[PDB]
């Protein structure tokens, strides 16, 4: 059929792609440079989609095919087509190459591909077993070049079990895997393992253990930008739930900055929602461009209403906002922070008063913030002066809030500190760029 | 030096953004005249940074040594 022949052609092109990736893996192991395995994994997400039964059937018929347990393991889980007319024997290894065992990296890549296909087919149980087998056989291996594919397979195994709605049978095993990766000095594998452990804790609400792990473990600096963004989001949630609001805001802004341009909509949605909540708690009204964006508009609409209520200062509006979308906030895992905002709303008003006025009288500030009595205003203002929200100094002798006089920052040292940080970053970037330089062997 | 480096950065912008691929290996050899790309480029960066670093270090050494 026309559709069938088109599918066969796409399968053949995918087979050519996998052959190219396996050749790259072999060249990487020969040259001991991750670059090639990194590119193979980079192409992996694209190949994850656009795969049917015959695709992987032909891949297993051509690759491997040594009568090994893999063929008797995945094939019983994946159907087999009839005698295809275009029986092109996809055999990159010919004669001696076929006899030689498949390279550990290449075999791991093929097992990862089959596991991804099982994921996309919702064969949760079969992917379970195939992932255990591949993980066990990769655990024995100790080649450095295998570590990146090991990290990818680790992440996909955690994902398969996450769809298994258990995500606890993995806790100890991923802890052990991450610890071994840390011992081995691996970077990508330990990065993915730490991110996945943090994700599991955040799912099951074990915040304290996650904070302990983040405090003790150290994330390698030379990690993937996407992995860094995921870790930043997880650490931002940990900090925000733990009352380190400023650090949470900074970390989540960094995570948003490091997001993959336009590749992951959902991660951006969640980061924006949590950042909006944290910023509202910290006393800053968030930017409207986020709410106006096309992809994030409908997702953040309840947060837009919440920000409206907070800025306007109408506690009743906040209550009706919670009534309509309270369950949505809960399902988003931000209900507790929203309640904290409900009881901290006065911080935004105090911050606005601090920005506007410089010597506001206590009675007038109490009137403006709809407080009942001036003494409550004094209490709230002092609490704000600690909370990093205001920089004033109450003069209780005459009861007026005297904001600190602004000073010429340039004549002070802060510009030197900012320039030092930026110059250090620039010099480090230059050193890193000239450091690799990928000079070929003559 | 900063103004002349701004002009030179304009020239470097023009040269790089062009990135003419009509045998780029030949392009880099048919425009070799000790010009914008790097010669009148980071040479000036080195001059500026050496002068500024030396001057600042001397100023701080004087602020410490002399009272």
């Amino acid at each position: 059929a026309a559709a069938e022949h088109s599918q066969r052609e796409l399968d053949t092109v995918t087979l050519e792609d996998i052959k190219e990736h396996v050749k790259q893996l072999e060249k990487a192991v020969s040259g001991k440079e991750p670059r090639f395995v990194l590119r193979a994994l980079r192409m992996l997400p694209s190949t994850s989609r656009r795969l049917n039964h015959y695709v992987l059937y032909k891949a297993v018929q051509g690759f491997f095919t040594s009568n090994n347990a893999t063929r008797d393991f995945l094939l019983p889980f994946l159907e087999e087509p009839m005698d295809t007319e275009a029986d092109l024997q996809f055999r990159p290894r010919t004669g001696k190459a076929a006899s030689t065992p498949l390279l550990p990296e290449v075999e791991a890549y093929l097992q990862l591909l089959v596991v991804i296909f099982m994921m996309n087919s919702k064969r949760y149980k079969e992917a379970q077993k195939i992932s255990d087998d591949l993980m066990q056989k990769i655990s024995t291996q100790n080649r450095r070049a295998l570590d990146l594919v090991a990290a990818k397979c680790y992440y996909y195994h955690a994902r398969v079990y996450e769809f298994l709605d258990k995500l606890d049978v993995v806790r100890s095993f991923l802890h052990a895997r991450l610890r071994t990766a840390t011992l081995r000095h691996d970077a990508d594998g330990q990065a993915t393992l730490l991110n996945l452990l943090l994700r599991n804790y955040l799912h099951y609400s074990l915040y304290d253990q996650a904070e302990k792990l983040v405090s003790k473990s150290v994330f390698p600096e030379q990690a993937n930008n996407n992995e860094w963004a995921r870790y930043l989001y997880y650490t931002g949630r940990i900090k925000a739930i733990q009352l380190e609001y400023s650090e949470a805001r900074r970390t989540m802004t960094n995570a948003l900055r490091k997001a993959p341009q336009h590749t992951a909509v959902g991660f951006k949605q969640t980061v924006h929602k949590l950042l909006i909540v944290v910023e509202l708690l910290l006393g800053e009204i968030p930017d409207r461009l986020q709410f106006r964006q096309p992809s994030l508009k409908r997702s953040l609409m309840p947060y837009f209403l919440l920000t409206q209520a907070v800025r306007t200062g109408n506690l009743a509006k906040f209550n009706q906002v919670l009534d309509q979308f309270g369950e949505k906030f809960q399902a988003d895992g931000t209900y507790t922070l929203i309640i904290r905002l409900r009881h901290n709303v006065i911080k935004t008003g105090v911050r606005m008063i601090s920005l506007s006025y410089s010597r506001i009288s206590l009675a007038d500030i109490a009137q403006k913030l709809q407080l009942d009595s001036p003494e409550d205003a004094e209490f709230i203002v002092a609490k704000a002066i600690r909370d990093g929200v205001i920089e004033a100094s109450i003069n209780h002798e005459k009861g007026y809030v005297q904001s600190k006089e602004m000073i010429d920052i340039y004549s002070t040292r802060e510009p030197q500190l900012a320039f030092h940080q930026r110059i250090s970053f620039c010099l480090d970037i230059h050193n890193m760029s000239v450091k690799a330089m990928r000079f070929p062997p003559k | 030096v900063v103004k002349e480096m701004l002009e030179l950065a304009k020239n470097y912008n023009k040269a790089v953004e062009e990135e003419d691929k009509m045998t780029p290996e030949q392009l880099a050899i048919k425009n070799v005249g000790k010009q914008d790309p790097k010669r009148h480029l980071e040479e000036h960066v080195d001059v500026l940074m050496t002068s500024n670093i030396v001057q600042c270090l001397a100023a701080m050494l004087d602020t410490v040594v002399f009272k």
């Binding site: 970037i429 | 480096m5 980071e42 940074m49």
Partner: peptide
């Protein structure tokens, strides 16, 4: 700081050029 930014940009451009040259040589190898 401006000099450091210029140096970093030049180094990054040189790294990009060298990487593309290496990739082109490898591709033309086979």
């Amino acid at each position: 700081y401006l000099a450091s930014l210029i140096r970093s940009v030049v180094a990054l451009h040189n790294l990009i050029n060298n990487k593309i040259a290496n990739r082109d040589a490898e591709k033309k190898e086979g």
